[PDB]
Amino acid sequence: LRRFDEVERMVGFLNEVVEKHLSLENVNDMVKEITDCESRARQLDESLDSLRSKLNDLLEQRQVIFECSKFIEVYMITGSIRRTKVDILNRILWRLLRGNLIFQNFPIEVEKDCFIIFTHGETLLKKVKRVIDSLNGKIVSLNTRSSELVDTLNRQIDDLQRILDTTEQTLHTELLVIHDQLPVWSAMTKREKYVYTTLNKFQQESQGLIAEGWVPSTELIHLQDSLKDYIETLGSEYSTVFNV
Amino acid sequence: AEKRTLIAVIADEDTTTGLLLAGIGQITPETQEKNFFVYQEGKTTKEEITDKFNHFTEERDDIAILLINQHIAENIRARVDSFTNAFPAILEIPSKDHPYDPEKDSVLKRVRKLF
Amino acid sequence: GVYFNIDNGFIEGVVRGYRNGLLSNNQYINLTQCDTLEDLKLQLSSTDYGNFLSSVSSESLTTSLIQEYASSKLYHEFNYIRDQSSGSTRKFMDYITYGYMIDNVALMITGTIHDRDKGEILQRCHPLGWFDTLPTLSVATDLESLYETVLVDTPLAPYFKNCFDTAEELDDMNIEIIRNKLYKAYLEDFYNFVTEEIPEPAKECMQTLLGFEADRRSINIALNSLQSSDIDPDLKSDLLPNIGKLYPLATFHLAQAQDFEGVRAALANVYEYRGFLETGNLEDHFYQLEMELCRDAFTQQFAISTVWAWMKSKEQEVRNITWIAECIAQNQRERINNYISVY
Amino acid sequence: MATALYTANDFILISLPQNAQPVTAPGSKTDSWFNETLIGGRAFVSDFKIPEFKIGSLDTLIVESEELSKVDNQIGASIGKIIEILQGLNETSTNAYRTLPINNMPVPEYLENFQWQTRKFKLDKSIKDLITLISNESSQLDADVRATYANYNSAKTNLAAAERKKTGDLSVRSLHDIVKPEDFVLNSEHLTTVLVAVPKSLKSDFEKSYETLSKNVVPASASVIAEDAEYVLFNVHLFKKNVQEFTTAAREKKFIPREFNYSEELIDQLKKEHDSAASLEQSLRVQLVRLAKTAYVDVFINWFHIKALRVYVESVLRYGLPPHFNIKIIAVPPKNLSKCKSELIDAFGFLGGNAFMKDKKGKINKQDTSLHQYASLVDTEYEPFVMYIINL
Amino acid sequence: AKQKMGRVMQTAAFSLAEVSYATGENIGYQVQESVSTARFKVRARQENVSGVYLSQFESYIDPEINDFRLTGLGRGGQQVQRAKEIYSRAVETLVELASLQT
C-alpha cells in the first residue's frame, strides 16, 4: 500500500506536468512504465525550469547594460535586483554612506529592477557589495565596453533559447503518449489502493483472510451463488467458507 | 586527534538535565540514540549502567570526555577500573549530595600504586 | 455577606482555619535555625503539617520529597474544599484547576517530542490539573490531531480559538506559544466568569488577584521573548492577556519591545510595577506582590476569593519550605532568609 | 530634547563650510545670525573651533565614521551609569554633576573654553590612536566605578545581617555584647549556659517551666537579659550533659533555643564581625564616592573629544573641501531645541542637499526603529547638514 | 581539581532541582527533546610534554547556536531562564579542568 501511495504521487506529478506544460503481472509491468516515464519526465522538467532560470539570468543582464549605457549617453555599481527590495537597498546604502551617493533605478522591461549607485570614494566599495549580495542583488560589472559584452551575451541567449526549443519540443512529444493514457494509469491506482486498504481490514489468522462484514438479506443468495461459481470455474481447489 | 567533540554523561537526572540545557550532549539525528544516560538513583539496576558504559566508551567513538558520578561509578566498579584508556577520558566527579572520595575515583587509585 | 453562608458557610470557615496554619515569620526563623532535614521535619511536626513525612523515617528523606508531600497535602485539602462546593463555588474551583490543566497539557506534549517515557513524564505533572484524557496526549504530534481527538471533550476546548495549526507538527518553539495562548484565553474566560457570576466583595478583590496573574504573565512573555524567540509583534500580541492593569497602553509597548529597555521603559509608566526591573530578583518581586495581594484578600470576610488567596499563599509556603530545606541540605546558608512571609 | 535633565543647558553642535550663507537671512553673516536672529535672540553662542586632524584615505574614511558613532554611544551610556551610581548614593540629589566644576570650571563655561585638550591627546598622533586611547580610558574608568558600587552593595548586606545578630530578631542571632561573668558561666566545663528565645506570650510560661526542662537546672537563673518586640531572650544555667534534655524539652513547650556558650573566642569573633563589617563599608564608601567624581570628569572630557572628532570627520565626508570649517557650540535654553533645530535646517540645509532635505525637529531616542538616530554606522534619517544634538 | 568540580556541579544541580520542583512539571523531559546540538564542544590538540604526545583539549562555545525554547512557560519559564545562565558558566568549568585528566 505504500507502493501504490508512491505511485499515486507519481501519477499526480504526471497530472501536474501536463497541466503545467487486471492480473498481478499486468499491474507489475505497467507500474514499470509509470516509473520509467515519471523519471524521464521529472529530469526533463528539472532540466527545463533550471534552464529557463539561466535564460532569465541573461535576459536580466542584457537589460542592465541597455539601461546603463543609456544613462551614460544621457566608482559606479550596476546590477539587477528584485523590485520589492529597491527602496530598502536605497535606505541601507543611504544609512551606510551618509549621503555620498546618486542612486537611480530603471525597471527591467517575478518583476525586477536595475540600479546605479555611484559610490563616490573608496573603503566602502566592498561593503556596498555586502548589502547588494545579501538581499539577492546581482551586480553586473563590465569594465570593457557596453557593445562587446552584448554580442557575447546575445550569442548565448539564442544558443540557450534553441536548447529550450529542443527540450520543450521533446517535452510536448512525451506528453502526447501520456495525456491520452493518464485515465488508465490513474484509475488503476485509485482502485488498487482501494483493494489493499480493504485487504488491511481482514484478519490473517491461519494463512487465510477472514472477511467479516454486512450484506443485506436479499443479496445473501446472490453472494452464495456468485462466490460458489467463481471459485470453481478457475480451478485452484481450495474452497471458501461463507458463514452467517 | 579531532574526531570527537561530545561530552557524554552518566549522572543523576537533575545534573544531566542541567548539563544538556547548557549544551554538551545530544540525541543524535541519524542514530536516534542518546549520547547521555540519565539515572534514577537506586531505582535502576546496576546492569543497565554497564551497557550504557560500554556504549559511550566503545560502541561510540564521538565521545571526547566521559563524565561519571562517584555514587554511580562505584556500583559498576569492576567495569570502570578495567577501562584504562584515554579515548574517551574517564573523569569521576562527586554525585549530587555526595562528597569527594578518592576511592570512588578510578584514575586516582591507578596513579597511586606504581608511582 | 447576607447570602454567602447558604452554600459557602462551612467552606469559608475551614479555609479560614487553613489560613491559620500559614507559617508566620517566627515559624520561619525557627525553620532557618535547623541543621538537618530531620530537624526540619521535626520542626514542621509542631505546626499544622504535623506528621506528614511520617512514612519516610530519616533515610529516604530528600529536599524534593518534602516538596512532594507538603504540596500533596495542599492538593488533598483543595480537593476536600472542592468536594463540599456546589453551584457557582464548584465552578469557581474548576476554573482554578483549568490553569494547571493547561500546564499539564504543555508538559505532556513536550514529553512526546523528546520521546521520553509516558510513565515518568506524568509523575512530573500537576495533580490538580488532572483530566481523564491527560495520558492520551501521547498519541499524536501535531496540534490538530491532539485537539480533534483528545482536547474536544476537555474543558480546555473553548481556549483553542486562536491556535493556528499551519500543519507543522510540533517543535519546542510553538508548544510554548500554544501554552501562552491557552493561558491567555483562559485568563480572559476566568476574568469574565469572575465579573459575571461571582458576588461583589469577592469580585473586586479577585479581579485584582487575576489581573496580577495576567500582568505577571505579560511581563514574563515580553521578557522571555528577547533571548529564545524571534517573533513579530503582531504575532506576539496574541500571547499577552487583555484583562489586567497593564493591557491597553503598556502591553502595546511590551509587544514592540525588542530590547530590555523596551520592557523597562514600558513598565516605568505603570505605577505599581515600576522598580521591579531595576534591582533585585524579579521573581521574588512578583511573589512578594502576589503575597501582598493575597494578604489583603483575607481581610474581606464574606468572599470566595479567600480560596484563591489561601491556595496561592499555601503554595508560597511550600515554596519557602522547599527553599529552606534546599538551603539546609546543600549546606548553603548565604540566602536562607530569602523566603517571603506576609503572615 | 532631554535624557537626564536637572537644570543643565542643552547644546547643539554645528559645523559648516566657510562659503556657507543663510537663505533665511540673505546676505547676513553666519556668526551674527546665531546670536541675533536665532530663536528670538535668546540663543547664547560660545566658540567651539576644533583643529585639523590626520584624515585617512577614502576607504579608511568610511571605517573612521563607523567607529566614531559606536564609541560615542558607549561613552554617552557609560557616563549615564556613573550619574546613576551617584544619584543612588545621594551624592547627586537636587542638582550636582551636570553643572558642577570640571577641573574647577562649570560645565557650560568648560564647553566655551573647549577647543581641543592637549592633556595627552596630540595632533602629531594618528586618528586611529586618538579613538583607541579615548575609548579605552572611558571603558576602564566606568569598570572601576561599577566594581566598587557592586562591592558596596554587598557590604551593606553583611552589615545588616550583623546588626540583627547583635540584637533584633532571634532566629540566627546569638548575643555577645551583653555578656557577664555570672549570667554567663563557663569557666571549667561543669556549668554551661543555654539561651532560650521565647515568644512574649510564652515569657510567663518559661519562668514557670525553666527548672522542669531537665534535671540539675540552676535556681533563679531565668531572667530576661535582653528583650525585643516579638521575643524575650532568656539565660538559664545548667549542667552540660543535661543540655540535650533541656533543648528538646524546650522545643515541646514551643520555645526556640538559641545555642551560645561563653567560650571566650566565640564572644570575641561575633563582636569582631560587626566591627569588621562596619569598617569595610565605611572605608569603601569614602573611596567610592571620591572615585566616581574623579571618574565623572574624565569621561566628560573624553565624551566631547569623540564628538569633536566625530563632527569634524563627518564634515569632511559630507561637504568635501574646504578642510577649514566654521564651527560653533550654541547653548540652547531648555525646551527651545526643536525650534532652534528647524531654523538651522532651513538656512543651511540647501548646502548638503537640495532634495535630500526635509524639515525635522528635536531628538527622539528609540529601539523601535533605527531611523532617527543620526549615525553613520546604522541607517538613520539623513540630516541636511551636519548637526548633532547634546542633552544634558 | 576533582574536589573543585564536585562543589560547582552540586551547587548548579541544586539550583536546577529547586526550579524543576517549583514549576510543577519536570523540565528535564522538555530539555531532552530540545537537546540535538551541544554548545560546548572541544577541539583536540597533541602537545609534546617531553618526547611523548599527550592529548590536550581547548573548548569552544558555538555562537552560531541559539537558546533552546524551554522558556515562556509563564512564571515557570522565568525560573528556567535564570537556570541555564548559571549552568553554562558552571559546565565550562568541568570541561577546562577535564583537559588535564586525559
PDB file of all heavy atoms in Angstrom, chain D residues 17 138 153 175 326, unseen atoms left out:
ATOM      1  N   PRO D  17      30.734  74.732   6.098  1.00  0.00           N
ATOM      2  CA  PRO D  17      31.754  75.263   5.268  1.00  0.00           C
ATOM      3  C   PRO D  17      31.840  76.807   5.368  1.00  0.00           C
ATOM      4  O   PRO D  17      30.858  77.538   5.637  1.00  0.00           O
ATOM      5  CB  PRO D  17      31.381  74.818   3.856  1.00  0.00           C
ATOM      6  N   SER D 138      37.718  55.635  28.727  1.00  0.00           N
ATOM      7  CA  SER D 138      36.354  55.715  29.091  1.00  0.00           C
ATOM      8  C   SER D 138      35.758  54.376  29.603  1.00  0.00           C
ATOM      9  O   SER D 138      35.042  54.374  30.618  1.00  0.00           O
ATOM     10  CB  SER D 138      35.514  56.229  27.912  1.00  0.00           C
ATOM     11  N   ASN D 153      27.383  47.422  47.749  1.00  0.00           N
ATOM     12  CA  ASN D 153      26.005  46.889  47.932  1.00  0.00           C
ATOM     13  C   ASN D 153      26.065  45.596  48.695  1.00  0.00           C
ATOM     14  O   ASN D 153      25.182  45.316  49.480  1.00  0.00           O
ATOM     15  CB  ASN D 153      25.222  46.558  46.631  1.00  0.00           C
ATOM     16  N   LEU D 175      23.841  36.558  71.078  1.00  0.00           N
ATOM     17  CA  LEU D 175      24.289  37.789  71.733  1.00  0.00           C
ATOM     18  C   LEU D 175      25.763  37.559  72.216  1.00  0.00           C
ATOM     19  O   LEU D 175      26.151  36.431  72.179  1.00  0.00           O
ATOM     20  CB  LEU D 175      23.361  38.176  72.901  1.00  0.00           C
ATOM     21  N   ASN D 326      33.804  76.470   9.794  1.00  0.00           N
ATOM     22  CA  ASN D 326      33.386  77.458  10.739  1.00  0.00           C
ATOM     23  C   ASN D 326      32.528  76.653  11.724  1.00  0.00           C
ATOM     24  O   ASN D 326      31.439  76.132  11.391  1.00  0.00           O
ATOM     25  CB  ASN D 326      32.360  78.519  10.228  1.00  0.00           C
TER      26      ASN D 326
END
